[PDB]
Design a protein around this ligand. Sequence first.
Ligand SMILES: C=CC[C@@H]1/C=C(\C)C[C@H](C)C[C@H](OC)[C@H]2O[C@@](O)(C(=O)C(=O)N3CCCC[C@H]3C(=O)O[C@H](/C(C)=C/[C@@H]3CC[C@@H](O)[C@H](OC)C3)[C@H](C)[C@@H](O)CC1=O)[C@H](C)C[C@@H]2OC
Ligand SMILES: C=CC[C@@H]1/C=C(\C)C[C@H](C)C[C@H](OC)[C@H]2O[C@@](O)(C(=O)C(=O)N3CCCC[C@H]3C(=O)O[C@H](/C(C)=C/[C@@H]3CC[C@@H](O)[C@H](OC)C3)[C@H](C)[C@@H](O)CC1=O)[C@H](C)C[C@@H]2OC
Ligand SMILES: [Ca+2]
Ligand SMILES: [Ca+2]
Lengths: 113, 113
Amino acid sequence: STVVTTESGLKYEDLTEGSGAEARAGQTVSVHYTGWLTDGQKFDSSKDRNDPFAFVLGGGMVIKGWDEGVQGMKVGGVRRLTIPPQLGYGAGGAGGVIPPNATLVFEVELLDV
Amino acid sequence: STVVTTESGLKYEDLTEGSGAEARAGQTVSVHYTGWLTDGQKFDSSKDRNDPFAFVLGGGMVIKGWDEGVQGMKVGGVRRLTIPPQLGYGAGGAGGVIPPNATLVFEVELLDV
Ligand SMILES: C=CC[C@@H]1/C=C(\C)C[C@H](C)C[C@H](OC)[C@H]2O[C@@](O)(C(=O)C(=O)N3CCCC[C@H]3C(=O)O[C@H](/C(C)=C/[C@@H]3CC[C@@H](O)[C@H](OC)C3)[C@H](C)[C@@H](O)CC1=O)[C@H](C)C[C@@H]2OC
Ligand SMILES: C=CC[C@@H]1/C=C(\C)C[C@H](C)C[C@H](OC)[C@H]2O[C@@](O)(C(=O)C(=O)N3CCCC[C@H]3C(=O)O[C@H](/C(C)=C/[C@@H]3CC[C@@H](O)[C@H](OC)C3)[C@H](C)[C@@H](O)CC1=O)[C@H](C)C[C@@H]2OC
Ligand SMILES: [Ca+2]
Ligand SMILES: [Ca+2]
């Protein structure tokens, strides 16, 4: 599989190509995800909480790297997103668990569109 | 299991009580469903299309019997809704497949909240 670096500095890699319907901005999508810091510390997993995550793709409610990175996935696909801090939580960080200026690694599995 | 007739004339029956989180108005929920006319003709199944259905519970986008009937389900639950036409498609019917003045029977399985 390839690593694509977009104009924003986002990087993504389709670990598994989906065979089902394509995700586009406007759709309400459902995913499983895991999130890690670059040192390999896991900060979240929806699979561990047994709770698929739904959001409006392109809705401006999730971090920029997600609204961008999830577009183009197909249902069944697993995509790895490497999100620079300016497309994540920036200088501010989050919840005392994501530090300032953190690059974030997510693996995202698309369950439904 | 019991059959509850609500103030609106909706009837519902929890065929299977869910063990997980409760559905409330405001949440984006995901369900599988099958829909039948009272004569036993199936008009739709999201399971047959392999496509869970997401909607905003209480969002005024689905027929009245759904916005009402899905509230109170728990994740894992299967509820049967018997929807009189005034809480469904009324005198107008739908898609040439649901006739005028049709009572509708849905079985709804809650997958996520
Ligand atoms: C309002 C009540 C809580 C409400 C919570 C939910 C619906 C439950 C939902 C599963 C979130 C998780 O709850 C277990 C948990 O997910 C993380 O662990 C995580 O993996 C993460 O990073 N995710 C979640 C998956 C999508 C990407 C990213 C996100 O974009 O999340 C969004 C996020 C935090 C955006 C910030 C918002 C503030 C801005 O200032 C900032 O702009 C820089 C961007 C989340 C979805 C918000 O839209 C909505 C909420 O927050 C966060 C590390 C902390 C977060 O808990 C808060
Ligand atoms: C806009 C583009 C299409 C858009 C379609 C989708 C998102 C795909 C989604 C799976 C719908 C199904 O597509 C395969 C299909 O589901 C049925 O088969 C069905 O089982 C049904 O009855 N459902 C769907 C499940 C929730 C309850 C009910 C409904 O409330 O559905 C809603 C409905 C029709 C409401 C009418 C709207 C008009 C009002 O005038 C009327 O007020 C009386 C109420 C649907 C979800 C609308 O909100 C959105 C849409 O329609 C209909 C028999 C026909 C419908 O296809 C159209
Ligand atoms: Ca969920
Ligand atoms: Ca769907």
